[PDB]
Amino acid sequence: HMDVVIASSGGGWQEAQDKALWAPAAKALNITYTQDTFQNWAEARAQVESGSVTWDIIQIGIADEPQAKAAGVLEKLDPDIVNKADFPPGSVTDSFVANSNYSTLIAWNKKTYGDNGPKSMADFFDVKKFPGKRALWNQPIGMIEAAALALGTPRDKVYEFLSTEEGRKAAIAKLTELAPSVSVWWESGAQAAQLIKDGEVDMIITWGGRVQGAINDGANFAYTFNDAQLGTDGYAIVKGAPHRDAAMRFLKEMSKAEYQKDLPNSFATAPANMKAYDLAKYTPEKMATMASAPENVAVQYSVDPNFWAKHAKWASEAYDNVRLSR
């Protein structure tokens, strides 16, 4: 009953955070914690709106942070909770603290296409050149943008294109056109990793760590950082969290470089605290799999939380229609 409740999205990502961050930080603070899993931020919104908040800390994506904050789902974090200078600019807000960088990328089945798989969004959406079963997320972040890239929008103009009603409509029409070839709308990263390990799909748009984990487990898949979305994951405290003050201390501790340095040990992720890189001498194999590595950054575009602050509601509704029509 004294336990701080921490919730992430499960699988290898939750295990990495638990092993590297939660278990050692709790021990150092003499605190006890309970874990939970969720896939959609609207589940935290439901707890707040019902007046029955059970979660303390929620790991969320940076583009969900503006709509969660606007809806009164997040607590305002104590002022000097982290040294913002240790983190990438914008990765720390008044209600969110980054823990990692990751990518929403293309992976393909080598049994189906060999080395000649889809290497861009245009290729992924091309059913004639690449016939086969596609897998997309059942949520729109990284999916709406993948359709904009498939339409031939340059990476640096993704959100400029999506700031227009015309651009937004064309991206939805592009997802609708691909929907007949989508065999599964995956819900969790562990389910996406399982589809890869079983070869149940020919191509998938999912998170890099999940892909790499499946490949390490023996999946006959390949992937590319080309046209991938560079994302930021982090922590927020739920408005009216039962253990608000203990959660705040837990968050301050787990954000330190001494814990962050261990996050890539069992999972292909990139720690958000820059001091972690000075503390840990990562292997070249590990470096190459990190989303925030310079060679990988060059072929990606960053997620824009300002776009999602404005059009998340329209996107969620329009994307639901693409999926429910097939």
Ligand X SMILES: O=C(O)CC[C@H](NCC(=O)[C@@H](O)[C@H](O)[C@H](O)CO)C(=O)O
Indicate the annotated binding residues for Ca(2+): 39, 189, 209, 268
Q: Any contact of residue 191 with ligand X (CB under 6 A)?
A: no
Helix 189-198 vs helix 208-216: crossing angle, to nearest 10: 40
Q: Any contact of residue 64 with ligand X (CB under 6 A)?
A: yes
Report the nearest approach of ligand X to the CB of residue 129 (Å): 28
Rounded Cα–Cα distance for residues 20 and 246 (Å): 19
Q: Any contact of residue 12 with Ca ion (CB under 5 A)?
A: yes
Q: What are phi and psi of 309, to 5 degrees?
A: -65, -35
Contacting ligand X (CB under 6 A), which of 6, 7, 13, 235? 13
Helix, strand or coil for residue 312? helix
Of 311, 185, 294, 167, nearest to 230 by C-alpha is 294
Q: Identify residue 179 by its one-letter amino acid code.
A: A
DSSP state of 163: T
Q: Any contact of residue 189 with Ca ion (CB under 5 A)?
A: yes
Contacting Ca ion (CB under 5 A), which of 190, 205, 219, 268? 190
Choose the binding region for Ca ion from 99-107, 226-234, 297-305, 316-324 (rule: CB under 5 A). Answer: 297-305
Residue with the two structure tokens 């498939």: 150
Number of Cβ within a 10 Å radius of residue 30: 6
**In degrees, to the nearest 5, what angle opens at C-alpha 24 toward C-alphas 18 and 29?**
120
Contacting Ca ion (CB under 5 A), which of 193, 196, 205, 251? 193
Residues 223-252 that bind ligand X (CB under 6 A): 233
Name the binder of 60 from Ca ion, ligand X, none, CB < 5-8 A by kind.
ligand X
Q: Any contact of residue 210 with ligand X (CB under 6 A)?
A: yes
Residues 265-304 that bind ligand X (CB under 6 A): 269
Site for Ca ion, rule CB under 5 A: 9, 11-12, 188-190, 193, 210, 213, 302, 304
